[PDB]
Swiss-Prot record, chain B:
Enzyme Commission number: 1.8.1.4
Phenotypic consequence of S454A: Loss of proteolytic activity. Does not affect dehydrogenase activity
Gene Ontology molecular-function annotations: dihydrolipoyl dehydrogenase (NADH) activity; flavin adenine dinucleotide binding
Phylogenetic classification of the source organism: Eukaryota, Metazoa, Chordata, Craniata, Vertebrata
SUPFAM superfamilies hit by this protein: FAD/NAD(P)-binding domain, FAD/NAD-linked reductases, dimerisation (C-terminal) domain
Binding site for FAD: 34-43, 52, 117, 146-148, 318, 324-327
Protein's name in the database: Dihydrolipoyl dehydrogenase, mitochondrial
Length: 482, 472
């Protein structure tokens, strides 16, 4: 109704809060603002709501990770070892992609329903800040719509970081977006970037039959902030699965050849040992960067930081005090739940509340198998900061739930403060890290000790018992079952 | 010759073997007596471990054999059950973990005595071995961890052939054409679901009007039952079993009636599983000669240090009161031994979680709605369905919900109830929250990773705290 302002709807709007972008940060901020009593508008330029995470991000990638893992379980040794015998296991890639698209479409429609349920006005168009208290939306038909608003919340998100000299065409040279919709399993695939996204998508296609190699300029996998012991052990596990890595390696160029294949030229990051690697599909995921194109920032005088982020204060105010920014467009880990939480507390602050977020309590997850997840500080951070800490480790090989499922890679590692026993970091490599890292985030919120967690009665048999036992080891020096 | 010990543990189940390890780690000279051929007690040998293994394997068989994998583009011409192989995978896990306990005993210098333990004096345990030989342990303290056994059904004799307990049901040699389960508690629903998935026509008969045993939330139980019924698991609730007859042809005639009276009928099956309960096991332990009287249900009365009326003789686990669960026995074993060493002894049974490892899973900790009503507590409710959770939607596995009960005035979390995927792992975050006295607001404001199933726990708390969630 009046809750959707698409092409042809061009009357001026008065709002209390105007959110630019409908990703995890923006759509949650919009809902929360309306729930707080603000007259709220959310502007989105794309055909669907939900931003990067829903449309080309978390959701399609997790769907393919799930499906590709199940294909591996059926097509490999796992099901046979359980007495589940199958004549011929065949991949129907079109059908697997259909399952992914169904999940995306359902959740995109969910956001639209939530906007309507909460009476958020959805303006479909390209938003540009045209005054301290005004956003102009330009729509697909060329029409414009003015929103005069008390507050503006920039949640314009991120884009793929281009590799200079390598042209992404989402055909044979793909970004994460193209890699999520390949029409056939490539015989050989090269991934530029062994960060979270690259390892996830590489593992997907490796499970489905591709020969996969990831090239990384740095000397570890898993992106920034990951614990080095965890990263090394994770890499070793992925290599045994067949995922190959060339770390400390820079890519010097890529050439599409006549036969349709791609020659990737590489050498040691410092220089030397030049070689060429050939592939059928090249995935470029060297990073993501904040997206602020045509937002009006320069005219407003809001200068960006050297990496393209909008500088904000602890209330998420830009230098113009009624203009705010959250999510992938500002500093901090580029994660959906981070954007969501910043959006909530920002609008809570607009309503007069306190604004505080502890980025040491924001978890990171890698949804491979085994999964990786961590929250708090790594050993390297504690060392850099001069913190005196102790370590507790527990392997999943000694966990009854993991052993019974014959799924026993990895360990839980707990870092605790020597004097006070306070949990400083939790790092999980193995099955179920997704859900276990959230128990750790709750503990960190309270400043809980390793002993605190060790004395919680965790259900037996569960993967979380390994978390309990790692904390027991950190607190008292020894676990029970290892 | 006799062994001199500081702590002598009778039984090597979750309670006993962990207590023994902990006692040795504290410096006690520790002996653990076990009558069975392997360590690990009920949980490892005929309990948690074999049941969870078959639950996993039969679930995966269901996914491959049914609609699920096809819907994901994983196409298979012919999916065949090899029951001998599925049982072998189960036995492999059991064997590895039983040997793991033996290794941990060796690593921690626990002395393993194989035999039937009887307390023969205030400071003496005698273990009698299968051949009749004896081993005497003179000991400062005795820790009774003798566990539980299946509760028999009067008039029905279990022979582990066609009328089985959980032990026999875990090792059937073939999928029975028709199977009747007496008792729709946790064990009965788990084992019935295993065999239903593998091809058996399964019906559970329950005297009460709900599935899932004592303490489960009624709303959760009803929604859980309807999901299982749509899978093909049939239930006769409010129904009493009047008898069972082993027949000449090898089948079983089960007589039933309405629990209140009336509607008498007979049901025939190939296998009858009797799981109406479990009871503490103290046979031939020497309690009567010591003057240690049992409570009316057969449990050993103990004080807050888990001392019996003889203060150097202790009891923990399934042989004492409280929920009959492995993690409960383990924690009691640890804190009992800590108390022997002089430390504080604390366990909050309101923070001890319960899990049902079906698919969907069920897990809860704290109080149910019925419990809060009985106690006169003024509470509020927050619910969040997995249909609205992004992680569940990505796997297309969207039954169930999280339900949070909070104290109306103070926002304190009073109970957490999970029906759906990953409940078994999610309830541990809930247990930590209850131990900490968390508020619904506390949890709502913790940054949970996206997309994860735990976000539904966050959103249910938000709904309980602020009145509304974000994504529903
Ligand atoms: C392949 C992949 C997998 C990922 N997996 C995960 C994961 O498992 N977990 C996780 O936490 N994160 C994951 N991420 C990251 C996650 O997607 C982002 O951190 C998150 O989407 C950021 O949310 P946001 O709201 O800040 O921005 P975005 O989601 O990027 O949303 C910004 C929105 O604003 C719109 N917009 C921009 N400018 C304008 C304008 N001028 N007018 C109108 N609309 C505008 C855009 O169209 C877009 O919809 C993944 C990312 C990728 C690429
Ligand atoms: C089918 C089934 C499934 C289950 N699933 C779960 C689950 O998923 N999660 C959960 O938490 N719980 C589960 N349980 C319950 C769990 O098995 C018990 O709560 C737990 O094993 C109790 O531990 P315990 O140490 O007190 O006793 P037990 O495990 O029963 O161990 C007692 C031990 O003492 C030995 N013993 C007894 N008397 C003597 C004596 N006189 N001398 C020497 N040795 C002696 C016995 O042989 C035995 O090894 C399940 C139970 C069953 C039957």
């Amino acid at each position: 109704e009046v809750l959707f302002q698409g092409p042809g709807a061009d009357q001026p709007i008065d709002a209390d809060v105007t959110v630019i972008g409908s990703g995890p940060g923006g759509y949650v901020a919009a809902i929360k603002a309306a729930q707080l009593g603000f007259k709220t508008v959310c502007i989105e330029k794309n055909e669907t709501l939900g931003g990067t995470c829903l449309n080309v991000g978390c959701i399609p990638s997790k769907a393919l990770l799930n499906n590709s893992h199940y294909y591996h379980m059926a097509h490999g040794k796992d099901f046979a070892s359980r007495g589940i015998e199958m004549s011929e296991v065949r991949l129907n890639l079109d059908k697997m992609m259909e399952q992914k698209s169904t999940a995306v479409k359902a959740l995109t429609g969910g956001i639209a329903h939530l906007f309507k349920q909460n009476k958020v006005v959805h303006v479909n168009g390209y938003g540009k800040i045209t005054g301290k208290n005004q956003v102009t939306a330009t729509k697909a038909d060329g029409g414009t719509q003015v929103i005069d608003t008390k507050n503006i919340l920039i949640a314009t998100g991120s884009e793929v970081t281009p590799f200079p000299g390598i042209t992404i065409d989402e055909d044979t040279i793909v970004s994460s977006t193209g890699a999520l919709s390949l029409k056939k399993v490539p015989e050989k695939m090269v991934v530029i970037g062994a960060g979270v996204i690259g390892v996830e998508l590489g593992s997907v296609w490796q499970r489905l039959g591709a020969d996969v190699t990831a090239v990384e300029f740095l000397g570890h996998v898993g992106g920034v902030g990951i614990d080095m012991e965890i990263s090394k052990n994770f890499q070793r596990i992925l290599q045994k699965q067949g995922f190959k890595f060339k770390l400390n390696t820079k890519v010097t160029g890529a050439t599409k050849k006549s036969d349709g294949k791609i020659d990737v030229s590489i050498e040691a990051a410092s220089g030397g040992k030049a070689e060429v690697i050939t592939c059928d599909v090249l995935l470029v995921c060297i990073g993501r960067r904040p997206f602020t194109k045509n937002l009006g920032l320069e005219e407003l005088g809001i200068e960006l930081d050297p990496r393209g982020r909008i500088p904000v204060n602890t209330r998420f105010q830009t230098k113009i005090p009624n203009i705010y920014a959250i999510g992938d467009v500002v500093a901090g880990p580029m994660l959906a739940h981070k954007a969501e939480d910043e959006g909530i507390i920002c609008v809570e602050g607009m309503a007069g509340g306190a604004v505080h977020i502890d980025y040491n309590c924001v978890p990171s997850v890698i949804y491979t198998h085994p999964e990786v997840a961590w929250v708090g500080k790594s050993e390297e951070q504690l060392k850099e900061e001069g913190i005196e800490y102790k370590v507790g480790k527990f392997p999943f090989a000694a966990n009854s739930r993991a052993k019974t499922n014959a799924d026993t890679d990895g360990m839980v590692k707990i870092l605790g403060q020597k004097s006070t026993d306070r949990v400083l970091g939790a790092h999980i490599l193995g099955p179920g890290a997704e859900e276990m890292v959230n128990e750790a985030a709750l503990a960190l919120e309270y400043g809980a000790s390793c002993e605190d967690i060790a004395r919680v009665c965790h259900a037996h048999p569960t993967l979380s018992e390994a978390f309990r036992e790692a904390n027991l080891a950190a607190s008292f020096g020894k676990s029970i079952n290892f």
